[PDB]
């Protein structure tokens, strides 16, 4: 689930706090996708 791994990424761990930080930088380059 490369498209649904986002919600599962935090499902296990508890880094959701930084998720909003890493998720914005990892998705800030969608133009190259």
From Swiss-Prot:
It comes from the Eukaryota. Its main location: secreted. InterPro entries: Pardaxin. It is found in: Secreted; Target cell membrane. GO terms for biological process: monoatomic ion transport. Monomer. In aqueous solution exists as a tetramer. Consists of a C-terminal hydrophilic region and a predominantly hydrophobic remainder. This is Pardaxin P-4. It comes from Pardachirus marmoratus. The lineage of its organism: Eukaryota, Metazoa, Chordata, Craniata, Vertebrata.
